[PDB]
Design a protein around this ligand. Structure first.
Ligand SMILES: Nc1ncnc2c1ncn2[C@@H]1O[C@H](COP(=O)(O)OP(=O)(O)O)[C@@H](O)[C@H]1O
Ligand SMILES: [Mg+2]
Length: 372
């Protein structure tokens, strides 16, 4: 339900056709900022709902404001996205939830004439890629001097791809006034490097708001699996398939060389595993780590002895064979899990006689395990 937000019954019915029945956190925490006219930078992980976080409050805003839509009117909202595929998706999301507003999407690799006719007939929300939008400014057909809202979607990707200069050329036309008359500026992305914000800041009022759901996100899950030591190898095979699977990276830490050597020879993982312990001379240790990084094998079994000082690559899954005594090392290893934006998984095995040790790890690391 939508009781906390000024969303009309018409919009709610369209949202149901898209499977939307309540607002995700990034949407709920940004609605009032966007709707009330504040400049905003919002950061949330990929897939968490950034598109509707700007599209729903903007559409409700325009539905209240643009009661008299004349032929030829200039857009009120501009959304720049870095690829044709991303621009199309954002435009589709707008046009699925408003049947009142004129929504247009301008990208390259497509005819100019149809875009000319959208501009002649009138546009309320313009979505596009920077290149084609800049072309239409230069050819004199697109009027961006009456914008009230500007969205830079996936702004990190957009500037990484080289669009800073084209974006600045487009926005220079729309921010010709002093601040109070400038468009509201909305930035949405999963990251915002320093150098990207240094570009965008030029278009943000000093009063801008920030919603960062990255800093509060659960990016590493801690699981504790109660297990007799004889079953560990078979369970390790299962959790590797679940959480690392194809093309994955797993590192297993154990106490003794015998455990590390036997675990790496166990038919549950042997075909994809190499071991690392204090008997291995430096040169082969280095060779083994290069093969772990370059995909030669997917499971590294290391004694806590060999792991002291070792530089740990990013991995999908960390497994501790028993609750670690060196919680500092555990905290460090857990921070290495989760690749390509995915949530990392750390698994601690434990036996009945080790259950209080799990509580000690929880206290010393300030975490809580999910017990399985
Ligand atoms: N409140 C919601 N309820 C249900 N599905 C949603 C909601 N918000 C977004 N989605 C869906 O989640 C998916 C990801 O949304 P998207 O805006 O692409 O995420 P992001 O831009 O954060 O990567 C889309 O299929 C979208 O329609
Ligand atoms: Mg998005």
């Amino acid at each position: 339900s939508f009781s906390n937000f000024p969303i009309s019954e018409e919009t709610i019915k369209l949202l149901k056709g898209r499977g939307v029945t309540f607002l995700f956190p990034i949407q709920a925490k940004t609605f009032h900022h966007v709707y009330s006219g504040k400049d905003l930078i919002a950061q949330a992980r990929t897939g968490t709902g950034k598109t509707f976080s700007f599209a729903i409050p903007l559409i409700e805003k325009l539905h209240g404001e643009l009661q008299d839509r004349k032929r030829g009117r200039a857009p009120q909202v501009l959304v720049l996205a870095p690829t044709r595929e991303l621009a199309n998706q954002v435009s589709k999301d707008f046009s699925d939830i408003t049947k009142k507003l004129s929504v247009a999407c301008f990208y390259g690799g497509t005819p100019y004439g149809g875009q000319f006719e959208r501009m002649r007939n009138g546009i309320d929300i313009l979505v596009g890629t920077p290149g084609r939008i800049k072309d239409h400014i230069q050819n004199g057909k697109l009027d961006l001097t009456k914008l009230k809202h500007v969205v830079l979607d996936e702004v990190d990707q957009m500037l990484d791809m080289g669009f800073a200069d084209q974006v600045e050329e487009i926005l220079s036309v729309a921010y010709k006034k002093d601040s109070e008359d400038n468009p509201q500026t909305l930035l949405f992305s999963a990251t915002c490097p320093h150098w990207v914000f240094n570009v965008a800041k030029k278009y943000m009022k000093s009063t801008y708001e920030q919603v960062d759901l990255i800093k509060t996100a659960i990016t590493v899950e801690h699981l504790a699996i109660k297990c007799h030591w004889t079953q560990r190898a078979a369970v390790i095979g299962d959790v590797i398939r679940v959480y690392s699977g194809h093309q994955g990276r797993t590192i297993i830490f154990c106490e003794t060389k015998k455990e590390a050597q036997e675990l790496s020879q166990n038919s549950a993982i042997k075909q994809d595993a190499q071991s690392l312990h204090g008997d291995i001379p430096q040169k082969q240790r280095e060779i083994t780590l290069k093969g772990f990084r370059n995909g030669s094998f997917g499971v590294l079994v290391a004694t806590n002895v060999a792991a002291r000082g070792l530089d740990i690559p990013e991995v999908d899954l960390v497994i501790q064979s028993s609750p670690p005594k060196d919680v500092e090392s555990y905290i460090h290893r857990s921070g290495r899990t989760g690749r390509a934006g995915r949530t990392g998984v750390c698994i601690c095995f434990y036996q009945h006689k080790e259950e209080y040790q799990l509580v000690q790890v929880e206290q010393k690391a300030g975490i809580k395990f999910k017990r399985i």
